[PDB]
Design an enzyme around this catalytic site. Structure first.
Site, PDB file in Angstrom:
ATOM      1  N   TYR A  87       0.786  -1.273   0.000  1.00  0.00           N
ATOM      2  CA  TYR A  87       0.000   0.000   0.000  1.00  0.00           C
ATOM      3  C   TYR A  87       0.793   1.284   0.000  1.00  0.00           C
ATOM      4  CZ  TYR A  87      -3.945  -3.065   1.005  1.00  0.00           C
ATOM      5  OH  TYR A  87      -4.873  -4.106   0.899  1.00  0.00           O
ATOM      6  N   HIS A 133      -4.271   6.131  -1.743  1.00  0.00           N
ATOM      7  CA  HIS A 133      -4.930   6.189  -0.453  1.00  0.00           C
ATOM      8  C   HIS A 133      -3.929   6.447   0.678  1.00  0.00           C
ATOM      9  CE1 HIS A 133      -8.867   5.902   1.204  1.00  0.00           C
ATOM     10  NE2 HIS A 133      -8.831   4.658   1.653  1.00  0.00           N
ATOM     11  N   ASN A 153      -9.798   2.169   7.306  1.00  0.00           N
ATOM     12  CA  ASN A 153     -11.152   2.252   7.812  1.00  0.00           C
ATOM     13  C   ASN A 153     -11.316   2.136   9.291  1.00  0.00           C
ATOM     14  OD1 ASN A 153     -11.606   2.422   5.077  1.00  0.00           O
ATOM     15  ND2 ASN A 153     -12.648   0.517   4.876  1.00  0.00           N
ATOM     16  N   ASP A 207      -5.805  11.650   1.477  1.00  0.00           N
ATOM     17  CA  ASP A 207      -6.137  11.711   0.070  1.00  0.00           C
ATOM     18  C   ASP A 207      -7.576  12.222  -0.122  1.00  0.00           C
ATOM     19  OD1 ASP A 207      -6.724   9.096   1.461  1.00  0.00           O
ATOM     20  OD2 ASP A 207      -7.740   8.588  -0.534  1.00  0.00           O
ATOM     21  N   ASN A 210     -13.186   7.157   3.968  1.00  0.00           N
ATOM     22  CA  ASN A 210     -13.437   6.123   5.003  1.00  0.00           C
ATOM     23  C   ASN A 210     -12.533   6.128   6.205  1.00  0.00           C
ATOM     24  OD1 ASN A 210     -15.834   4.897   3.928  1.00  0.00           O
ATOM     25  ND2 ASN A 210     -14.540   4.196   2.235  1.00  0.00           N
TER      26      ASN A 210
END
Length: 193
Positions: A17, A22, A70, A95, A116
């Site tokens: 990631y 994100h 999240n 973001d 989120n």
């Protein structure tokens, strides 16, 4: 105005990631930390990576939740409560789908805007913290949002986002010194070179 004393970057953990859109917030806070030589260390008590040091004459804490996006509130909420940092002294970098690459805005207050990570935070500390909205573009349709935010930008878009982040990094002094309206004017005026 409250000085900003806690700067949070939102994102996901793991090397798969680290370069995805994100994680724009992680990019901002990692770069900030290294610019001022603040060491980010594993902080399992608060489910994140955190540090503390001097930024332009002020003692500032930095936080990266390691909860996955999240669930960011599981780190941000107890951390800010433990150190008794009010929302007004918090900046959260994240973001922003609704702005293009190269666009960056400082916002005070308001809701999650569908983000989120923010969704997991606003319910618990309320809305009155500052946000650094780092534009990552929107992929046209609702179906492709997940693949966009969890994907890596191409070079051109990445340069634009990097340029925007560089610019905001140069304004962190106004933020930690309490000059939030000045910082907002100056960040929000950015346009790429």
């Amino acid at each position: 105005m409250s000085n900003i004393s806690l700067i949070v970057g939102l994102g996901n953990p793991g090397s798969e990631y680290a370069q995805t859109r994100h994680n724009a917030g992680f990019w901002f806070v990692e770069q900030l930390a290294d610019k001022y030589g603040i060491t980010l260390k594993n902080d399992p008590k608060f489910h994140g990576i955190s540090g503390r040091g001097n930024i332009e004459g002020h003692d500032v804490r930095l936080l990266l939740p390691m909860t996955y996006m999240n669930r960011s509130g599981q780190s941000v909420v107890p951390f800010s409560k433990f150190y008794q940092i009010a929302p007004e002294a918090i900046l959260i970098a994240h973001d922003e789908l609704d702005m293009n690459p190269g666009v960056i805005r400082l916002k005070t207050g308001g809701g999650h805007g569908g983000h989120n990570g923010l969704r997991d935070i606003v319910p618990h500390i309320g809305p009155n913290f500052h946000r650094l909205r780092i534009g990552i573009g929107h992929p046209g349709s609702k179906e492709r949002v997940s693949g966009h935010v969890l994907g890596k930008a191409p070079s051109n878009e990445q340069s634009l986002m990097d340029g925007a982040i560089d610019h905001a990094l140069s304004k962190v002094k106004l933020l930690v010194q309490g000059q939030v309206p000045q910082a907002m004017n100056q960040i929000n005026a950015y346009k790429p070179a």
